[PDB]
Write an enzyme that holds these catalytic residues in place. Structure first.
Site, PDB file in Angstrom:
ATOM      1  N   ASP A 277       0.826  -1.179   0.000  1.00 35.74           N
ATOM      2  CA  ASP A 277       0.000   0.000   0.000  1.00 35.74           C
ATOM      3  C   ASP A 277       0.903   1.288   0.000  1.00 35.74           C
ATOM      4  O   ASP A 277       1.022   1.942   1.026  1.00 35.74           O
ATOM      5  CB  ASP A 277      -0.827  -0.085   1.274  1.00 35.74           C
ATOM      6  CG  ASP A 277      -1.821   1.053   1.428  1.00 35.74           C
ATOM      7  OD1 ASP A 277      -1.989   1.899   0.492  1.00 35.74           O
ATOM      8  OD2 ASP A 277      -2.448   1.112   2.519  1.00 35.74           O
TER       9      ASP A 277
ATOM     10  N   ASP B 186      -3.703  -0.868  -6.358  1.00 35.85           N
ATOM     11  CA  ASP B 186      -3.593  -0.428  -4.949  1.00 35.85           C
ATOM     12  C   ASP B 186      -3.726  -1.729  -4.110  1.00 35.85           C
ATOM     13  O   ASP B 186      -4.500  -2.647  -4.472  1.00 35.85           O
ATOM     14  CB  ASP B 186      -4.747   0.560  -4.612  1.00 35.85           C
ATOM     15  CG  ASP B 186      -4.530   1.325  -3.285  1.00 35.85           C
ATOM     16  OD1 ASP B 186      -3.496   1.123  -2.625  1.00 35.85           O
ATOM     17  OD2 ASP B 186      -5.396   2.156  -2.880  1.00 35.85           O
TER      18      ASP B 186
ATOM     19  N   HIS C   4      -3.046  -1.367   6.730  1.00 33.71           N
ATOM     20  CA  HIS C   4      -2.913  -0.237   7.687  1.00 33.71           C
ATOM     21  C   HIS C   4      -2.415  -0.709   9.026  1.00 33.71           C
ATOM     22  O   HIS C   4      -2.796  -0.157  10.069  1.00 33.71           O
ATOM     23  CB  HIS C   4      -4.186   0.561   7.801  1.00 33.71           C
ATOM     24  CG  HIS C   4      -4.440   1.386   6.558  1.00 33.71           C
ATOM     25  ND1 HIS C   4      -5.427   2.348   6.464  1.00 33.71           N
ATOM     26  CD2 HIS C   4      -3.770   1.434   5.379  1.00 33.71           C
ATOM     27  CE1 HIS C   4      -5.384   2.919   5.270  1.00 33.71           C
ATOM     28  NE2 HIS C   4      -4.383   2.395   4.600  1.00 33.71           N
TER      29      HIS C   4
ATOM     30  N   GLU D 106      -2.407  10.116  -1.241  1.00 32.87           N
ATOM     31  CA  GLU D 106      -3.660   9.314  -1.297  1.00 32.87           C
ATOM     32  C   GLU D 106      -4.193   9.137   0.165  1.00 32.87           C
ATOM     33  O   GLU D 106      -5.407   9.149   0.395  1.00 32.87           O
ATOM     34  CB  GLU D 106      -3.357   7.963  -1.885  1.00 32.87           C
ATOM     35  CG  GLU D 106      -4.637   7.121  -2.159  1.00 32.87           C
ATOM     36  CD  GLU D 106      -5.074   6.261  -0.923  1.00 32.87           C
ATOM     37  OE1 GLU D 106      -4.270   5.961  -0.053  1.00 32.87           O
ATOM     38  OE2 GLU D 106      -6.255   5.878  -0.831  1.00 32.87           O
ATOM     39  N   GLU D 107      -3.296   8.957   1.143  1.00 28.89           N
ATOM     40  CA  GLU D 107      -3.805   8.569   2.498  1.00 28.89           C
ATOM     41  C   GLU D 107      -4.274   9.778   3.314  1.00 28.89           C
ATOM     42  O   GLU D 107      -3.742  10.892   3.113  1.00 28.89           O
ATOM     43  CB  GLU D 107      -2.696   7.927   3.292  1.00 28.89           C
ATOM     44  CG  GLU D 107      -2.141   6.600   2.699  1.00 28.89           C
ATOM     45  CD  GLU D 107      -3.025   5.391   2.898  1.00 28.89           C
ATOM     46  OE1 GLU D 107      -4.218   5.530   3.326  1.00 28.89           O
ATOM     47  OE2 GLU D 107      -2.479   4.271   2.578  1.00 28.89           O
TER      48      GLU D 107
HETATM   49 ZN   LIG Z   1      -3.638   2.702   2.711  1.00 24.28          ZN
END
Ligand SMILES: [Zn+2]
Length: 323
Positions: A127, A210, A292, A163-164
């Site tokens: 990720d 992703d 995550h 993106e996060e």
């Molecule tokens: Zn992520």
């Protein structure tokens, strides 16, 4: 009034035969990707950090060394965040920037911000360090074919920053690089000099990778307007499998399965999808079990699955580009 932005609706692939399929399977190297493209990205690289700078340099240098005529652009901008105004930098790498149409492969190169926790550092291996290294490996493996591009149709790679969420996902804290770039592309005439068409009209298809690199991914067919391209991935997986060109792979455990998914997944495709760009969203469902957490690391990656996916994606891209 040119109908050129409709060409992507009728575009058909030029399918590779067995011998060309073997040649692609043999021309990609999972161990070279691993050492040369992936490992330098397995670092903390949240936006604005020194690792975000090192990641960007690595991605640019790996592209710069290739023979094909890539044009690199850094798209740097400010956005409000929960920590105040910050700077973000998308990386865009384009073959034939004036070509009217591009196939676009994309991923995010930032890693989610976390405090170090019991001396562990989040490096977002699936990720999305692995998607980034897959795009670099594809550029490297296909470099001699891509050199030939030097259908007014070519290839573009985008590595999004931000993106996060800096916190947990919210509309104003996530997708910083994609929300910006989608807005910028929608308001940029294309090809240069055009009266009425934008860089987004030029995006034939956004293929967003992703959360790739865990065992047993299953990618659903999310969108009716790219469903026929999702079927091409199934056909390519099935034919590489039948030719003996995949490793530790079975059709019962195939990655591209017949099933749709109604819900919305928040990711970098969203600002493009909402402006009408066709998306093929290569994110698995369910997400990797390490999603995550500090365990999203190199040791939990599944090498032969990434290798298999590099083969399928490289074949998809040659067939799309008629190379
Ligand atoms: Zn992520």
């Amino acid at each position: 009034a040119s109908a050129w932005p409709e060409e992507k609706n009728y575009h058909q692939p030029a399918i590779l035969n067995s011998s060309a399929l073997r040649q692609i399977a043999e021309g990609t190297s999972i161990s070279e990707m691993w050492q040369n493209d992936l490992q330098p990205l397995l670092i903390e690289r949240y936006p604005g950090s020194p690792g975000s700078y090192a990641a960007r340099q690595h991605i640019m240098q790996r592209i710069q060394r290739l023979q094909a005529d890539w044009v690199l652009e850094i798209d740097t901008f400010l956005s409000q965040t929960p920590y105040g105004y910050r700077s973000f930098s998308n990386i865009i790498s384009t073959l034939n920037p004036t070509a009217k149409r591009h196939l676009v492969l994309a991923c995010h190169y930032d890693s989610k911000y976390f405090s170090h926790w019991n001396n562990r550092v989040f490096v977002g291996a699936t990720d999305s360090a692995v998607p980034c290294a897959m795009m670099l490996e594809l550029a490297r493996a296909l470099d001699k074919k891509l050199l030939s591009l030097k259908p007014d149709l070519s290839l573009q790679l985008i590595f999004f920053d931000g993106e996060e969420a800096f916190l947990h996902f919210s509309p104003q804290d996530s997708l910083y690089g994609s929300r910006h770039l989608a807005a910028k592309m929608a308001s940029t005439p294309h090809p240069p000099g055009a009266r009425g068409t934008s860089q987004l009209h030029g995006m034939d298809l956004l293929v967003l990778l992703d959360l790739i690199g865990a065992p047993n991914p299953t990618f659903p067919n999310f969108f009716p307007n790219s469903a026929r391209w999702f079927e091409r991935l199934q056909a390519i997986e099935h034919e590489l499998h039948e030719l003996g060109l995949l490793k530790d792979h079975s059709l019962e455990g195939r990655y591209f399965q017949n099933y749709s998914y109604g819900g919305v997944i928040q990711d970098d495709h969203i600002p493009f999808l909402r402006r009408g760009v066709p998306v093929l969203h290569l994110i698995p469902s369910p997400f990797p079990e390490v999603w995550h957490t500090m365990d999203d690391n190199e040791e939990n990656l599944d090498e032969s699955t990434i290798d298999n996916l590099n083969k399928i994606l490289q074949v998809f891209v040659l067939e799309y580009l008629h190379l």
